[PDB]
Design a protein around this ligand. Structure first.
Ligand SMILES: CS[C@@H](C)[C@@H](NC(=O)[C@H](CS)NC(=O)CCC[C@H](N)C(=O)O)C(=O)O
Ligand SMILES: [Fe+3]
Length: 328
């Protein structure tokens, strides 16, 4: 397969007050969004080597007893409130992947949306402090660091579409965002179970099938082991790895609001027998957020699509993705 066009864009102007420089970044985001749908964010300000080291100290020290105690509902019937947040177990001999998901640290027991039991809002669960010293405080601080990067990126997407810079960011707030971090471990295994390997129609061995993302945008750190592919008009292409930057793409909410001007790219995960990390931040809005759909290709900007609230979008999308590609 040939190599996918994935440009490196320096996103540092998006943090400052130089309006013309921000426009130059916006144009590069527009070009990448109309082409393969992917780019690397560089000069982002975040210490990704320390993120990798802290995440590795956690995955490698957590015990089977602690994983049952933190497990989501799909693995532990006792934990009916845990649909999104908590531990997603491996199944030795059948399923290789395992992961930990956490939500907004402001979703405390006194938060009005947790009091009302609104779908998609949960209070995070954490391992014992004495067993994992410093982990919960590191992980909460990381949520705010990648939140800050994502707010800057959202300024560049708004400019790219001909809008004012707070068009998306106004709907992305500390007190109510539905955004999530997932710390995915893909393990080295000897022998690697064949039941954990899927085969595409074209014969390619996979760990996760073709899909579009459920997000507005996705903001991803990975290790330096090549595995991602993107569908283009020329067929599936390889995305090169870069463990110093963040890989960015649009999810299906952005394709809805823009009448498919910025498509949600179809992508998949090749099977590789290597110990590695996939650490996505899914940029989601608030439960009642609505952006009216438009079409930047039409003279009058009007679209034949209906408004959809972010909450309804997120709940149905996460269920459909489990029915399509399986419980992770
Ligand atoms: C290249 S796709 C990627 C970054 C990842 N998959 C995923 O993270 C898959 C597909 S996007 N996403 C999901 O499984 C959605 C998880 C939602 C989360 N529990 C929440 O509650 O917000 C992986 O397999 O590396
Ligand atoms: Fe994805």
């Amino acid at each position: 397969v040939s190599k996918a066009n994935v440009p490196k864009i320096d996103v540092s102007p998006l943090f400052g007050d130089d309006q013309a420089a921000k426009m130059r970044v916006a144009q590069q985001i527009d070009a990448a969004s109309r082409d393969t749908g992917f780019f690397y964010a560089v000069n982002h300000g975040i210490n990704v080597q320390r993120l990798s080291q802290k995440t590795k100290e956690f995955h490698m020290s957590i015990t089977p007893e602690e994983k049952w105690d933190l497990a989501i509902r799909a693995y532990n019937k006792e934990h009916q409130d845990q649909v999104r947040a908590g531990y997603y177990l491996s199944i030795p001999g059948k399923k290789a992947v395992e992961s930990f998901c956490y939500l907004n640290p402001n979703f405390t027991p006194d938060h009005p949306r947790i009091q009302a039991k609104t779908p998609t809002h949960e209070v995070n669960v954490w391992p014992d402090e004495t067993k994992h010293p410093g982990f919960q405080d590191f992980a909460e601080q990381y949520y705010w660091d990648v939140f800050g990067l994502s707010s800057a990126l959202l300024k560049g997407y708004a400019l790219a579409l001909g809008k004012e810079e707070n068009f998306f960011a106004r709907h992305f707030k500390p007190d109510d965002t539905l955004a999530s971090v997932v710390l995915i471990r893909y393990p080295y295994l000897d022998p690697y179970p064949e039941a954990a390997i899927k085969t595409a129609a074209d014969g390619t061995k996979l760990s996760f099938e073709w899909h579009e993302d459920v997000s507005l945008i996705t903001v991803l750190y990975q290790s330096n082991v090549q595995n991602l592919q993107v569908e283009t008009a020329a067929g599936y292409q390889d995305i090169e790895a870069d463990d110093t930057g963040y890989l960015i793409n649009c999810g299906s909410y952005m394709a809805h609001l823009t009448n498919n001007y910025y498509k949600a790219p179809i992508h998949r995960v090749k099977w590789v027998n290597a110990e590695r990390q996939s650490l996505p931040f899914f940029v989601n809005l608030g439960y009642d957020s609505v952006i009216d759909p438009f079409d930047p290709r039409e003279p009058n900007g009007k679209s034949d699509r209906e408004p959809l609230s972010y909450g309804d979008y997120l709940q149905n999308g996460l269920v459909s993705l489990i029915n399509k590609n399986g419980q992770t």
